[PDB]
């Protein structure tokens, strides 16, 4: 049963089982092309593949580029094989993954970091092409060798950037895993404290914050509760602008900029696909 993956220059321990064919799942170690995501049986087979494989980046359209960081929009109907490979690969680290086979109704936003050999996979999020529940993320992953460096938050931030450009309010697909809820709560806090740090008025509505940030009103209210910023005095509810919370936020956001782990809206060249 599958225990590790060879992926470019990394060797990755798998968290959960993924339904690779038994011919492969029978092995303990699976070899992957880091660019087209084909899975193979041995180092030897991979080496032969790497001599033949033309791909040096995801398929699809590069819609974000800031220096060495890119995001590629892959259509699951146009690149079924790549997206299915991506889906089997993500299930090695997702406890509960929506689906694997029918990738056609989904778009995949694949984030990469470039060096002189090509555009290497950092992570991705999928997104329903047409979601009744207005979910702007279906699943999201940062590859293990990249985890806990701020790329997950860039992926989340990017998913809301798409929503803004579509003039939509978005929300992640329920249910949220523990790692996902921690990351979303961190992002929501950042976005809420940033808005309030910049707003000079003395009253605001949830809808106003929601329409500016593309964040859903319920998650806004939920973050306000988590921050203990919803108080009750006399008859109505008030927002408590906690000094420390924004004080810690400017110190934290200083460190974020310093490390360049931010998405930059002016680096997005994108018009929403096949729905506008």
């Amino acid at each position: 049963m599958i225990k590790t993956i060879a992926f470019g220059r990394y060797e990755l321990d798998t968290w959960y089982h993924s339904p690779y064919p038994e011919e492969y799942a029978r092995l303990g170690r699976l070899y992957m092309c880091e660019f087209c995501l084909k899975y193979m049986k041995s180092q030897t087979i991979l080496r032969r593949h790497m001599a033949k494989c033309v791909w040096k980046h995801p398929p699809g359209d590069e819609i974000y580029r800031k220096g060495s960081i890119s995001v590629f929009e892959v259509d699951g109907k146009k690149n079924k094989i790549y997206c299915q490979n991506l889906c089997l690969l993500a299930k090695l680290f997702l406890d509960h993954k929506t689906l694997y086979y029918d990738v056609e109704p989904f778009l995949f936003y694949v984030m990469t970091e470039a060096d002189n050999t090509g555009c290497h996979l950092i992570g991705y999020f999928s997104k329903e092409k047409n979601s009744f529940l207005n979910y702007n993320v279906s699943c999201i992953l940062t590859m293990p060798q990249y985890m806990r460096q701020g790329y997950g938050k860039m992926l989340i931030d990017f998913s809301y950037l798409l929503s803004k450009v579509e003039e939509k309010v978005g929300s992640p697909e329920r249910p949220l895993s523990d790692l996902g809820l921690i990351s979303y709560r961190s992002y929501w806090k950042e976005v809420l404290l940033r808005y309030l740090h910049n707003f000079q008025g003395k009253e605001i509505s949830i809808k106003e914050i929601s329409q500016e940030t593309a964040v859903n009103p319920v998650d806004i209210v939920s973050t306000l509760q988590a921050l203990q910023m919803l108080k009750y005095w006399k008859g109505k509810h008030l927002v408590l602008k906690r000094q420390d919370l924004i004080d810690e936020w400017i110190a934290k956001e200083a460190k974020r900029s310093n490390s360049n782990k931010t998405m930059d809206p002016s680096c997005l060249k994108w018009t929403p696909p096949k729905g506008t």
Binding site: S205, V218, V221, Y232, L238, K241
Partner: peptide, 28 residues
């Protein structure tokens, strides 16, 4: 008809999404 429920300091509450809410610093 967009409203949210939860509790603040042992008190169940209910909040509108369109009503302006007042921002404060540290007064009472």
């Amino acid at each position: 008809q967009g409203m949210v429920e939860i509790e603040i300091e042992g008190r169940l509450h209910r909040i509108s999404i369109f009503d302006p809410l007042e921002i404060i610093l540290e007064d009472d």
